[PDB]
Amino acid sequence: NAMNFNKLKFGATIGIIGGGQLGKMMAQSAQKMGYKVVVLDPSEDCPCRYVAHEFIQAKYDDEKALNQLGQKCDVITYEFENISAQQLKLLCEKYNIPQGYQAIQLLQDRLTEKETLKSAGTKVVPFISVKESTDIDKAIETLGYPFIVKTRFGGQVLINNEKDLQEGFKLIETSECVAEKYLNIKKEVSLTVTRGNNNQITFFPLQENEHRNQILFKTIVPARIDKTAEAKEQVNKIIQSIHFIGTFTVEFFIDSNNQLYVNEIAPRPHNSGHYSIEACDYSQFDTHILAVTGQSLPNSIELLKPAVMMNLLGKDLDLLENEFNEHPEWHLHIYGKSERKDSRKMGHMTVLTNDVNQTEQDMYAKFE
Amino acid sequence: MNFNKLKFGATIGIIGGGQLGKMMAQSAQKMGYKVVVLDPSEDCPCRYVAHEFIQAKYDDEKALNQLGQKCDVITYEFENISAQQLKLLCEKYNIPQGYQAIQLLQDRLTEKETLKSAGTKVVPFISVKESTDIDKAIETLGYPFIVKTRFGGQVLINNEKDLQEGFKLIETSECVAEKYLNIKKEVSLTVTRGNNNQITFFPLQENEHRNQILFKTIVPARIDKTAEAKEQVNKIIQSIHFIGTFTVEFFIDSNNQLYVNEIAPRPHNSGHYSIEACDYSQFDTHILAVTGQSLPNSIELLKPAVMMNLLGKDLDLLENEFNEHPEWHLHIYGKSERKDSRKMGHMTVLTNDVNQTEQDMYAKFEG
Numbered sequence: 156n157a158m159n160f161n162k163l164k165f166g167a168t169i170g171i172i173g174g175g176q177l178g179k180m181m182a183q184s185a186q187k188m189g190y191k192v193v194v195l196d197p198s199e200d201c202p203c204r205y206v207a208h209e210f211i212q213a214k215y216d217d218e219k220a221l222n223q224l225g226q227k228c229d230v231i232t233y234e235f236e237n238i239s240a241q242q243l244k245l246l247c248e249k250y251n252i253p254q255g256y257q258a259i260q261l262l263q264d265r266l267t268e269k270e271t272l273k274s275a276g277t278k279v280v281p282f283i284s285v286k287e288s289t290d291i292d293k294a295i296e297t298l299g300y301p302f303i304v305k306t307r308f309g310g311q312v313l314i315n316n317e318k319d320l321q322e323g324f325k326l327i328e329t330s331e332c333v334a335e336k337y338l339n340i341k342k343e344v345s346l347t348v349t350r351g352n353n354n355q356i357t358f359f360p361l362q363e364n365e366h367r368n369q370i371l372f373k374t375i376v377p378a379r380i381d382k383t384a385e386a387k388e389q390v391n392k393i394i395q396s397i398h399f400i401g402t403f404t405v406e407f408f409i410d411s412n413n414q415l416y417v418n419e420i421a422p423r424p425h426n427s428g429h430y431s432i433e434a435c436d437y438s439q440f441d442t443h444i445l446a447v448t449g450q451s452l453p454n455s456i457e458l459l460k461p462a463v464m465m466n467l468l469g470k471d472l473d474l475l476e477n478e479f480n481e482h483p484e485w486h487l488h489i490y491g492k493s494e495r496k497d498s499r500k501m502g503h504m505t506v507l508t509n510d511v512n513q514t515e516q517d518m519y520a521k522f523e
Numbered sequence: 524m525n526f527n528k529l530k531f532g533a534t535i536g537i538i539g540g541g542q543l544g545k546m547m548a549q550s551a552q553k554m555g556y557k558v559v560v561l562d563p564s565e566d567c568p569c570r571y572v573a574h575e576f577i578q579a580k581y582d583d584e585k586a587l588n589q590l591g592q593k594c595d596v597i598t599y600e601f602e603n604i605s606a607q608q609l610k611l612l613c614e615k616y617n618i619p620q621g622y623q624a625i626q627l628l629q630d631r632l633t634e635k636e637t638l639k640s641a642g643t644k645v646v647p648f649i650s651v652k653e654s655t656d657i658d659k660a661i662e663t664l665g666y667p668f669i670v671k672t673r674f675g676g677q678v679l680i681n682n683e684k685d686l687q688e689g690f691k692l693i694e695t696s697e698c699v700a701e702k703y704l705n706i707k708k709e710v711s712l713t714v715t716r717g718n719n720n721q722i723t724f725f726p727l728q729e730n731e732h733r734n735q736i737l738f739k740t741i742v743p744a745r746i747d748k749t750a751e752a753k754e755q756v757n758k759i760i761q762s763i764h765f766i767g768t769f770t771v772e773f774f775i776d777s778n779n780q781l782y783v784n785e786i787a788p789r790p791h792n793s794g795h796y797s798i799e800a801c802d803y804s805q806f807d808t809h810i811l812a813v814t815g816q817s818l819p820n821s822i823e824l825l826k827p828a829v830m831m832n833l834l835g836k837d838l839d840l841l842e843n844e845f846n847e848h849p850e851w852h853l854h855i856y857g858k859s860e861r862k863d864s865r866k867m868g869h870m871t872v873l874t875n876d877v878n879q880t881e882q883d884m885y886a887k888f889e890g
Contacts (some may be wrong), residue, residue: 160845162793165855165868183549186572189855191866206552208571309734318678395564436826436873437849445849453849459825480528483803483811483819489531489555502531 156398159353163229164451165189170210171448174201174213176490176500178234179426180432182206184440190448196223202490203234208252210421218242219244225250232401232447234423237264253400253447258422261397265333268306268420273398277389277417280408288324289340294334301337306330313337338416344378344387347428349402349442351452360437360458362427363384364406370498371426373518374464375511381408385415393420402443404428405441417483426466426500433486433505434462449519460507463514467502469495471522525718526619526766528815529595531555534574535810536594540567540570542856543790544600544691546798548572548661550806553561556814561590568856569600582608591616597769598813619766619813624788625685627763629698631673640679641762643755643783646774660700661769667703672696679703704776708720709746709784712752713794713805716765717812725805727752727823728793730772736864739884741877742829743802748773751781759786768809769792792832792866799852799871800828826873829880831888833870836863840890 157243171178171184174196182192183206194207197214204210209227213220213239224231231252233243240260245255261268273277283294285304293357294302301315304323312323315337326332343366347359363378364371389403403423406418428439436457445452467475469485472495479487489502509513529535534607535551536630537544540562544762547842548558548569562571563580570576575593579586581603599609604628613622627634629870638645644838649659660680667681668691676696678689680703692698709732729744730737757770763786771789772784793806802823811818833841833853838861855868873882 164845165853179552183553183572186545186857187549187854189857190570191857205558205574206549206572249538304531329889410667434797451844457826462825476530479530480816483817487531487555488553491555491557 156247156255156257158206159332160400160449161229161251161337161353162226163190167191167229167448168193168227169235169444170224170231171195171203171207172197172206172221172224172231173234173237173480174203174210175234176202176502178203179206179439179490180229180425180429181232181234181443182442184438187251188441188444190444193224197222200493202492213241214455216242218245221246221251222227230447232258235423237465237511242358249280253435253449255398255400257398258403258420262420262422264308265305266325266331271396272393272417275392277392278415280335280338280416282333284333285327285334288327289326289426291323292333292358296447301333304332304334307333338408339411340408341411341413342380343406343418344380344382344386344409345406346375346383346390347425347431347439347444348390348399349452350399350437351446352400352449355446355452356388356394357395357452357454359428359431359439359456362430364427368498370468370494370500371466373466373515374427374430374462374523375509375515376458376464376478377460378428380409380413381509382409382415389415391419393417395423401446402428402439422442423425426503427464429503430462430464430487430505431456434458461509461511463506463508463511463518465504465506465522466500467504469497469499469501472501473513475521526813528718529556533557533595533814534593534811536561536597536598537569537573537600538587538590539599539600539603540564540569540573540576542568544873545568545572545810545856546795546804546806547598547600547790550804551620552809553819554810559590559593561586562885566859566860573780581605583642586607587612588615591817596789596813598809599625605733616822619790619815621764621766623764624786628788629674629785635699637762638759638766640782641758644781646701646704646784647784648701650864651689651693651700651711654693655699657686657689657693662699664702666738668700669703670698670700673699673853678868681769687814693742704774704782706774707777707779708744708746708775709772710752710775711740711770711793712756713768713770713791713797714756714765715805715808715812715818716760717818718815721818722760723818723820723822724753724756725794725801725822726779728796728804734864736834736866737832738888739832740793740828741881742796742828742830743824744875745815747777748775748781752838755781755783759783762765765790765878767812768794768805769846794871795854795869796821796828796871800826801875811812827877828871828873829877829884830869830871832861832866833868835861835865835867837888838867839863840885859884 168191192207195211244257361378363375365373404421474489558573559575610622727743727744731739798804812850
């Protein structure tokens with residue numbers, strides 16, 4: 156909604172909805188810059204809690220607590236798709252939330268997201284609504300094989316042949332779905348972006364992402380596939396349809412034919428952007444705080460040195476934690492979570508390097 | 524002389540909660556260490572980046588002991604606790620920095636005599652305790668020379684007319700006299716030392732002071748004294764025990780002779796640029812060292828930098844411009860009470876043209 160919003164100076168208070176690693180890192184940028192931080196999260200053990208001037212323990216559905224956080228802050232931002240869009244909407248109406256509620260609302264709804272992106276003139280993966288058993292017939296006819304059916308609201312079945320059709324019938328029964336073409340994906344990249352006051356926008360270096368088990372495993376900067384220009388064009392069509400301020404990320408597929416497709420949008424700092432803390436002259440959190448408090452953003456971000464960022468899951472710590480002592484060049488971030496679980500994101504690692512290919516090979520060896 | 528290797532999840536205690544404590548605490552949490560901070564003020568800048576805050580004076584032995592109880596390792600962020608109290612603490616708890624450097628540098632005479640003993644380049648000096656000693660200073664050192672209180676007070680003696688004022692410093696406290704040199708440049712070397720004699724140097728820093736307060740740090744230093752400065756640091760390390768990050772400030776006189784000036788056995792103001800400019804910060808490496816982790820073998824200057832301190836009077840002047848300048852990289856400490864000469868923050872400007880940026884900064888700060 157607001158093109159121009161309050162310019163808050165050091166000393167003002169920033170509220171953060173959610174206290175995970177993302178809010179943690181926001182809050183550290185904020186306190187570095189002289190901003191006070193209030194963080195809200197149901198968990199007493201959230202990683203953000205002891206980098207906040209004040210901690211409000213409550214669930215994201217709790218209207219009173221969210222209102223207390225409003226009363227306490229000169230601006231509010233959010234670190235995960237936690238809060239309901241309806242609660243967010245109410246909150247934007249009463250307090251200063253330059254991010255607005257529109258992006259969160261839209262991004263909860265796979266069908267409408269896909270349609271507004273298509274209406275934007277952005278290159279989305281072809282798609283169809285699968286409301287009823289009968290629509291699956293349409294889908295085979297229009298999309299696959301292979302095609303993937305995902306739940307429309309807030310589950311996936313890959314569907315390669317008829318051998319997978321019965322399993323798919325099962326999901327449309329429970330909840331409404333959306334079907335997409337299943338691309339033979341050459342590579343995967345992302346663009347982290349920050350949008351500020353008076354239509355200012357700045358772009359981070361195109362990032363190259365590897366996933367393992369649908370969890371981000373490796374990010375390499377600079378992306379080894381030149382798609383910066385096309386990614387920016389798609390991002391620019393995106394911003395005409397969806398309002399962002401602060402940092403957001405757009406994820407992309409590159410198919411077999413070097414063709415670029417918008418995949419997913421994160422209306423917040425994103426895992427694929429963490430490398431920027433060490434490798435850039437601003438981090439995705441630095442700019443997020445500048446944007447949200449209404450300051451000028453830098454015109455460009457400089458990649459000071461190339462980098463390979465590895466997530467650290469519970470299982471990765473189990474494997475690697477005894478070697479950390481010996482590798483200062485790993486630039487460890489450890490979030491502070493009490494409870495290690497195998498696939499839980501416990502920290503990450505950013506290796507600055509002049510040889511990204513070689514560094515990549517070292518990590519494969521290292522994480523096997 | 525090796526110190527416990529502490530893994531993430533361990534607890535670091537910080538004596539003192541000013542901005543140096545704050546920046547240590549921020550690295551520590553980044554790296555997954557818990558932080559307990561002690562400081563007499565509820566307003567201290569480090570308070571809300573600590574897991575725990577112990578509000579207490581620096582001579583509060585009971586609280587100094589609660590801290591040790593709660594911590595796997597303790598570091599001090601500044602000269603705060605007395606030498607004898609720090610010594611007892613070091614004997615009872617894990618404090619890699621030790622008490623020796625604090626104790627030495629609390630005594631200007633022994634400091635000087637120990638540096639000389641170590642073979643470092645020290646400004647020529649003599650003890651002035653008694654009225655007669657001034658005459659030795661007149662002869663040996665010559666005008667001008669400066670009379671500095673041995674413990675803890677200062678007076679510059681350009682000629683005869685100042686002798687009265689110096690005599691009146693000798694009446695009260697004990698002193699050491701030094702040649703007052705014409706200083707052409709000041710530089711400092713920030714250094715981190717850890718387990719197994721590992722030693723890593725930051726890039727040589729060129730410092731400018733105004734009113735005895737650090738004003739501007741330029742990196743890389745525009746005087747080529749890196750080799751020499753290291754040789755001096757290597758001699759000092761022989762005589763003085765450091766673990767963690769420490770800084771040695773030097774003078775260069777108008778004949779290009781280098782002199783050890785001051786030693787800080789802790790992260791130092793002139794090192795803050797390294798947060799934006801280098802691949803590791805003086806704070807990152809401090810935490811690595813003090814927790815018994817391996818250090819990087821070198822530090823890389825990713826881009827040159829001009830850092831300015833922001834005192835209260837500088838905020839008064841410039842704070843309304845901050846929003847237009849993301850390239851200043853503003854650090855604002857969080858101190859509630861602004862005073863004209865109090866350190867409130869700093870700014871680090873990365874640049875590919877140090878000299879142009881220095882001119883820009885002189886004009887911005889002139890007001």
